[PDB]
């Protein structure tokens, strides 16, 4: 049903848009096979499910923030300050910080998510949409070689296309980890904590296996 799925989401991104199964259980109150078959028809669009032995469920979404500067309506993304929602725009911006405006609100009913208040879609946005990760080096061309850069670099040393899902490269030499001690620095400073890049991590990774 729509609105079970609306509520796990909901439920998820109350606990930082990640839950083990038995917690998640504790709180839906539907039966495991109940619970697993709510997920596995949803889709990994929705909820991804890994096994860490120990099932856990992260929180995702198909829907995007605009990237344009002055964005000519209609529209069909979120209208938002980028910025705000990383916790570096507090100071004039010309963007939105009225989260859950009318517009965002007929964006989140064709997402389904028109239940979630303002930090619950915050927590969905950080982790789903590629657009609030730090800019990578766009001089990365892999690892394994002497020039990984042209530099002597404070950019991200990842996969561009691992990010966006589409990595179907057979035997790419781009980094794919993003759990990395200086990945999480970069991270950390561009406003994304650990437990947000686990849960980036874990979704790319998901992508990955479809595309
Ligand atoms: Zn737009
Ligand atoms: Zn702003
Ligand atoms: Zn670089
Ligand atoms: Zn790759």
């Given at each position: 049903?729509?609105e079970?799925?609306?509520?796990?989401?909901?439920?998820?991104?109350?606990?930082?848009?990640?839950?083990?199964?038995?917690?998640?259980?504790?709180?839906?109150?539907?039966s495991?096979?109940?619970?697993?078959e709510?997920?596995?028809?949803?889709?990994?669009?929705?909820?991804?499910?890994?096994?860490?032995?120990?099932?856990?469920?992260?929180?995702?979404?198909?829907?995007?923030?605009?990237?344009?500067?002055?964005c000519?309506?209609?529209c069909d993304?979120?209208?938002?300050?980028?910025?705000?929602?990383?916790?570096?725009?507090?100071?004039?911006?010309?963007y939105?910080?009225?989260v859950?405006?009318?517009?965002?609100?007929?964006?989140?009913?064709?997402?389904?998510?028109?239940?979630?208040?303002?930090?619950?879609?915050?927590?969905?946005?950080?982790?789903?949409?590629?657009?609030?990760?730090?800019?990578?080096?766009?001089?990365?061309?892999?690892?394994?070689?002497?020039?990984?850069?042209?530099?002597?670099?404070?950019?991200?040393?990842?996969?561009?296309?691992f990010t966006?899902?589409?990595?179907?490269?057979?035997?790419?030499?781009?980094?794919?980890?993003?759990?990395?001690?200086?990945?999480?620095a970069?991270?950390?400073?561009?406003?994304?904590?650990?437990?947000?890049?686990?849960?980036?991590?874990?979704?790319?990774?998901?992508?990955?296996?479809?595309?």
């Amino acid at each position: 049903d729509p609105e079970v799925c609306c509520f796990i989401t909901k439920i998820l991104c109350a606990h930082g848009g990640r839950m083990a199964l038995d917690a998640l259980l504790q709180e839906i109150a539907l039966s495991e096979p109940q619970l697993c078959e709510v997920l596995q028809v949803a889709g990994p669009d929705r909820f991804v499910v890994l096994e860490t032995i120990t099932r856990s469920v992260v929180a995702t979404t198909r829907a995007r923030v605009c990237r344009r500067k002055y964005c000519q309506r209609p529209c069909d993304n979120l209208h938002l300050c980028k910025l705000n929602l990383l916790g570096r725009c507090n100071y004039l911006c010309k963007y939105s910080h009225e989260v859950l405006s009318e517009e965002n609100f007929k964006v989140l009913k064709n997402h389904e998510l028109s239940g979630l208040n303002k930090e619950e879609l915050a927590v969905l946005l950080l982790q789903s949409d590629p657009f609030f990760m730090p800019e990578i080096c766009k001089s990365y061309k892999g690892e394994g070689r002497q020039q990984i850069c042209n530099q002597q670099c404070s950019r991200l040393h990842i996969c561009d296309h691992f990010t966006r899902g589409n990595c179907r490269f057979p035997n790419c030499l781009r980094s794919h980890n993003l759990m990395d001690r200086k990945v999480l620095a970069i991270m950390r400073e561009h406003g994304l904590n650990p437990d947000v890049v686990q849960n980036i991590q874990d979704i790319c990774n998901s992508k990955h296996m479809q595309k």
